[PDB]
Symmetry: C3
Subunit: 258 residues, 3 copies
């Protein structure tokens, strides 16, 4: 069973836009403590992991863990109906064939009620995140977006190099090249702008501009993105929600991978 309704349909429409783009399907599933989901591009280098806590729903009941996959573009079309304030109510029975998305106006005039035929995925969820990542930084999300779009002009691969007290994005391509370089610092004038960074061992990872571009669409969800990198493992970029989060595990380039 499943019955969950958000206050503002925007929140759910915001989140889904965050990965609607980098993955073809998403296998959603509700647990007693909230909703979670996961997706992997066909290119098999990008993993999307989502969690919306109960804390984010005005009503929520998942009395029996219903797993349900579905095409994202199809889900986005149904979410276009959005109304970003008028109540969105996910509804899905015990063993569903389609999830019913129900929007209702502030009164009872509009019964916008869509049903989206679910997909069929042979659920193989992955737990690849790890305990210790070589380096860990965070920074204003939009600062990060700029850097990622910018450098992706020059090259198809952005290189993220982290050394002691120095974070350096560098794109080197054909027309030329360029590199943004930032340093950790505080700002109690609005601490959520200060660049936090710990580095257990300096790291140098190169990723695909393509994918990174997708990963920054989660910026419309948080004030600060957090990036953790590991030499022997996909880097974990994350954006926090009011209860829950949205994380993208991107596999660093071998020479391919991106």
């Amino acid at each position: 069973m499943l019955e969950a309704k958000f206050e503002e349909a925007s929140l759910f429409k915001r989140i889904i836009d965050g990965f609607k783009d980098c993955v073809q399907l998403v296998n959603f599933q509700c647990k007693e403590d909230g909703i979670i989901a996961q997706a992997v591009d066909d290119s098999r280098v990008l993993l999307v992991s989502l969690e919306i806590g109960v804390e984010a729903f005005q009503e929520y009941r998942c009395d029996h863990p219903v797993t349900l996959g579905m095409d994202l573009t199809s889900l986005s079309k149904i979410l276009r109906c959005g109304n970003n304030t008028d109540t969105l109510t996910l509804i899905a029975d015990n063993t569903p064939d389609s999830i019913i998305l129900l929007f209702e106006d502030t009164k009872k005039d509009r019964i916008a009620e869509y049903s989206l035929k679910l997909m069929d995925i042979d659920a193989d969820f992955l737990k690849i995140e790890e305990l210790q990542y070589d380096s860990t930084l965070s920074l204003p999300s939009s600062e990060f977006s700029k850097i990622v779009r910018d450098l992706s002009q020059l090259s198809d691969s952005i290189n993220i190099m982290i050394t002691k007290e120095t974070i350096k994005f560098v794109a080197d391509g054909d027309i030329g090249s360029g590199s943004v370089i930032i340093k950790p610092f505080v700002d109690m004038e609005h601490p959520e702008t200060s660049i936090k960074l710990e580095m257990d061992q300096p790291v140098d990872l190169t990723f695909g501009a393509k994918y990174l571009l997708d990963i920054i669409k989660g910026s419309s969800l948080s004030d600060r993105v957090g990036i953790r990198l590991s030499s022997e493992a996909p880097a974990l970029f994350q954006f926090d929600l009011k209860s829950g989060f949205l994380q993208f595990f991107l596999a660093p380039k071998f020479n391919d991978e991106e």
Copy 2:
């Protein structure tokens, strides 16, 4: 002869945008009491009927019913010059080859004067609207636009079902389906939001999302669209003007038609 000038060129540029899109040509023609026009798509299921009363012109003289057809996209290009406030003056002689559209600034500096070569249509105007339509409703135009765009995401055909005190748009397609359902109601707090509906006999008509999408572009002309449906006849959607109107007669789907 013909000499008609609107106060704000916007009004005429607004109207023409309303059907510029769903028809290839329009056969314009002036009568002593105003200007009227009609168009039918090549697909032969959509009829556009327009009427701009004298009441809407600052000057108007049609001393001898000049019928003049013309391509819409071509007319739209000439209307792009629009200036939405600066005086547009339609001018066309007794037996014209082209209509002269003249814009002049608030003084005499700008003589924007275009001439558009008329087309040649063997005028066969149609009077297909009828006395009694099975059901009749009206509603905020934008409410209607939403419903039409929305449902057209799911399907290529929107179905409009009208029963006692229940108006229900339903699109059922491949990714899934969905239906908006509204009920008649008043609102003296701004009566032009209240949903008026009379139903002599309940009706169930299915149309083409494609066409309906075009029909809602007339929303930029009125606060409320009016829809009248008939079992044995094209549905009449209309948008009222300050003297005159703009109506689209769309032929309900057999299985084809849209």
Copy 3:
């Protein structure tokens, strides 16, 4: 050597957008009194001539005339990083292979430093502007833009006819035709709106709508464009800068040329 930094990176990003579009390459070069540049489309009828005085830089040193060519689209990509306020510093050594464009935030956090591989052009600068042009006019730039976009709807060639106290743009095409006509006049209420025009001999020149469309993108640089026409010579359209300018020499149509 070369080291020049603008206060607001916008100014340089504004200028380059002005011709980024109508030319493939630009051969930049610094002289003791400022920076200048020139470009010619492959179509060989449009010349772009630029000059940014020292007066427009917060710092400037060109101790040895370094000529450097470069692709514009590539330059525009690097200028997208723009930040329109944060300091852009052009840097190029004595005999460069690439120009380094350096943006820095208001503090020292962001070292956006790009390098653009220069091109290789066998510099043949042209001095084709002349002493006396048959007619000379100026007018609000945006007034001019309108006229140029408008008429380019009807035709592929705009004709500029200048007679005593009458400036008349006329496009005559297939769907029809149209002509804007203006007259010289003063306005001490904001003199920079008054249409200045001297005519030593009346002129009638026809140009390519295509090119003229490009020439008006320099409007985002000045309040008034200035057009000087000559029977036996490319017309000179210009936009003035705070020290310097931007001029486009367009070759009038023979029947071809545009």
